[PDB]
């Protein structure tokens, strides 16, 4: 029954509008892509102190509704609705652990939920869309703050509609 709302108190839309995930205690930093491992293109999601508010996301559920509830399984993606090149997934990558990364394919039903935490929301990843969720937090490696599973230590965000663009 809990509807996810933006910083204006309005329900977050199902895919139609983009939003920034603004850390509640890191408004100076914002989501960006960075390199991980030996990869030559930046595919990992980090919280970058040089970009604020960072790359906006869309939250998508296949349900034919235009709001998002905390109980829904979601895809989260960067970029326009029309593109699936920015879709989040969680991928094992040493030495980060289970890192949030982008890829260019998308399941009908994504593996994330947005759940109330503290003064805002946390992103929770459910392997195999099962019952047990793993909190997404920050892992500091290589001078970067990677979004990655850090269960019990979630990064807490508020959700700001991206009407500045």
């Amino acid at each position: 029954s809990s509807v996810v709302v933006d910083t204006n108190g309005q329900p977050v839309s199902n895919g139609a509008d983009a939003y920034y995930l603004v850390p509640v205690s890191h408004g100076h930093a914002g989501l960006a892509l960075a390199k991980i491992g030996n990869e030559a293109e930046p595919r990992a999601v980090v919280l970058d102190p040089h970009h604020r508010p960072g790359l906006p996301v869309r939250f998508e559920s296949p349900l034919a509704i235009n709001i998002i509830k905390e109980s829904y399984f979601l895809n989260i993606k960067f970029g326009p609705s029309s593109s699936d090149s920015g879709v989040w997934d969680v991928i094992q990558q040493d030495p980060i652990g289970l890192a949030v990364k982008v890829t260019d394919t998308k399941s009908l039903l994504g593996p994330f939920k947005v759940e109330k935490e503290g003064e805002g929301y946390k992103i929770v990843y459910y392997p195999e869309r099962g019952q047990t969720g793993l909190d997404i937090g920050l892992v500091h490696r290589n001078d970067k703050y990677y979004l990655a599973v850090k269960d019990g230590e979630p990064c807490v965000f508020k959700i700001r509609k991206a009407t500045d663009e």
């Binding site: 029954s1 509807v3 329900p11 199902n14 895919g15 139609a16 998508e60 559920s61 296949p62 349900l63 034919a64 509704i65 235009n66 709001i67 509830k69 829904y72 399984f73 609705s81 029309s82 009908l108 039903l109 869309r129």
Partner: protein, 223 residues
């Protein structure tokens, strides 16, 4: 509703609007004078339900009623497996007087027939990504269970059926959840889910298969 048209006013007098802070978030279907059927994913702890509407402005709709409801019962197997068994019954606080613009509809007992053309109605998004000002209607045709399971396995379950996917790009879309799919004079389905974007050739939408639930609906309404 994608590639539909304005409904003839009050031609779907079972249509219910579920509104939150004065904005529609799902539809439902009046199935008894005190009960609205909708998708379980539309559950809220309380509801404001608009009956007899065409536009969503009750102050411009003679014969309409805006009614409160506290109690709702989701199907006990909702979301196991994921997305399946997507129906709930909302008990209105008071029984409504039925009229020619507010009327219950009977539920199909027979399951959907592959190929049959049916009608879906709602206030959800149009092809242009805007919301309509009045209730929209469109025809979509039932697709076989073989095609529905090929496209949607591993999430196809027989509490669902598929309709649409024509060259005509007629479909339901976001904001149509919980609304009716009428086949051959009876309520056959509820708008449930689909692949985005709406209106893709060869991709039908998924509807709650209400023929599977007639006993649970009757028992819940009578209890």
């Amino acid at each position: 509703i994608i590639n539909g048209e304005d409904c003839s006013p009050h031609s779907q007098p079972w249509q219910a609007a579920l509104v939150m802070e004065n904005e529609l978030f799902c539809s439902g279907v009046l199935v008894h004078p005190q009960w609205v059927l909708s998708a379980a994913h539309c559950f809220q702890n309380s509801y404001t339900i608009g009956l007899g509407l065409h536009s969503l402005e009750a102050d411009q709709e003679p014969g309409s009623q805006m009614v409160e409801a506290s109690l709702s019962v989701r199907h006990p197997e909702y979301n196991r497996p994921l997305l399946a068994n997507d129906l709930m019954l909302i008990k209105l606080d008071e029984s409504v007087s039925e009229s020619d613009t507010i009327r219950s509809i009977s539920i199909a007992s027979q399951c959907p027939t592959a190929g049959n053309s049916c009608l879906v109605s709602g206030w959800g998004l149009l092809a242009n990504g805007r919301m309509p000002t009045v209730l929209q209607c469109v025809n979509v045709s039932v697709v076989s269970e073989e095609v529905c399971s090929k496209l949607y396995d591993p999430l196809y379950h027989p509490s669902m059926f598929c309709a649409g996917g024509g060259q005509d790009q007629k479909d339901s879309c976001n904001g149509d959840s919980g609304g009716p799919l009428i086949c051959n004079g009876y309520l056959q389905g509820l708008v449930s889910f689909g692949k985005a974007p709406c209106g893709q050739v060869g991709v039908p939408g998924v509807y709650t298969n209400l023929c599977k639930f007639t006993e649970w609906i009757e028992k819940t309404v009578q209890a």
